[PDB]
């Protein structure tokens, strides 16, 4: 049954409710939709004004043609503004994902639809892009046959990059090598279907975890001599597993996101038993991030055009209902499928989220909700 834009009804209701739902909702229409979103580590608070400066790494997603890697700066109001572009960089096709390197945030690696993984240094490109449309990346990383999404810099080994892909493979690069072409140090062939996401462990230089359309969680160790078989194997979901995120404070705890609409909590120490299933999304889940501030806070997003925020400490609490007890908040601000989101590393509870209708929202739920 078509014509169903029931979507518009609920956006009308949502907007009317923000005064008692958020301490901050910002909306901005992007020139093309962005597939990707990540805050840069740096916060500036100018000694005079009543706002602070943050910055995002975004991309474009065009319809034939001309895409750019985007740096946007964001002005956020203080206790006592508007979002603009800082620089565009010509990009070979849509930016499937953009991720800065922790050891050098000037460095950004991007996933294109064209097999290639590209490495940019945005401080080495003009704020005004060459109108030719030409892409001149600082590195070209080779190993994949197909596009991918999953991407992850190693926080404990500078320069080491993992990429996930449709060709069923995961690739490792350490870019500390030699036109500007570098080949995979290693290719992990564990998965049997499309690999959806890959992420480094946050303390252990050697471990990382991947997810694939074969419904599997595999934990990898890089010392291992076998690139055809991971340290562990899980049947993570009853459908595709699209993203994962290690707990930034609890070294054994990670979360997975699935086409089955559930968020699966995992304990590395025993992957045979699922810790939990967050059920409330009404459609596919494509992103999951731990809050970098509070150890028990988790967010997720996807096709059902919503962003759920969970607090896992209220698992099991008694109630009279309209959803799980651990369900802390439902952000209904987008009128399309959400592509990516990012916790603000410096302003607690502030989240950026970007959707398929070019809407970028910088927002924050009300404080009485989490007290």
């Amino acid at each position: 049954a078509v014509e169903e834009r029931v979507i518009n009804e609920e956006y009308k209701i949502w907007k009317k409710n923000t005064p008692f739902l958020y301490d901050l909702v910002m909306t901005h229409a992007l020139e093309w939709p962005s597939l990707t979103a990540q805050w840069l580590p740096d916060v500036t608070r100018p000694e005079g004004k009543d706002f602070s400066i943050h910055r995002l790494v975004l991309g474009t997603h065009t319809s034939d043609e001309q895409n750019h890697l985007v740096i946007a700066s964001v002005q956020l109001p203080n206790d006592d503004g508007k979002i603009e572009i800082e620089i565009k960089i010509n990009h070979e096709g849509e930016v499937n994902r953009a991720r800065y390197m922790p050891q050098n945030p000037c460095i950004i690696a991007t996933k294109t639809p064209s097999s290639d993984v590209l490495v940019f240094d945005y401080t080495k490109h003009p704020s005004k892009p060459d109108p030719s449309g030409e892409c001149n990346p600082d590195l070209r990383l080779r190993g994949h046959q197909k596009e991918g999404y999953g991407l992850s810099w190693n926080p404990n080994l500078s320069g080491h990059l993992l990429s996930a892909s449709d060709d069923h493979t995961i690739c490792l690069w350490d870019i500390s090598a030699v036109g500007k072409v570098v080949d995979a140090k290693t290719i992990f062939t564990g998965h049997t279907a499309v690999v959806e996401d890959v992420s480094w462990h946050l303390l252990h230089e050697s471990l990382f975890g991947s997810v694939a359309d074969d419904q599997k969680l595999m934990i990898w160790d890089t010392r291992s001599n076998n690139t055809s078989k991971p340290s562990h194997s899980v049947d993570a979901h009853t459908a595709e597993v699209n993203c994962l995120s290690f707990n930034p404070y609890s070294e054994f705890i990670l979360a997975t996101g699935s086409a089955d609409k559930t968020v699966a909590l995992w304990d590395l120490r025993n992957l045979k038993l699922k810790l939990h299933s967050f059920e409330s999304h009404k459609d596919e889940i494509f992103q999951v991030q731990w809050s970098p501030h509070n150890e028990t806070i988790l967010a997720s997003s996807g096709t059902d055009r919503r962003l759920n925020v969970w607090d896992l400490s209220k698992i099991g609490e008694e109630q009279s209902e309209d959803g799980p007890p651990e369900l802390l908040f439902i952000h209904g601000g987008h009128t399309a499928k959400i592509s990516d989101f990012s916790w603000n590393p410096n302003e607690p509870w502030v989240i950026c989220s970007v959707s398929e209708d070019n809407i970028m929202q910088v927002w924050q739920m009300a404080e009485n909700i989490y007290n």
Partner: peptide, 12 residues
């Protein structure tokens, strides 16, 4: 298997 990103994104 590109049912993660739409075909024909729109411009504003």
């Amino acid at each position: 298997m590109s049912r993660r990103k739409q075909a024909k994104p729109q411009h504003i």
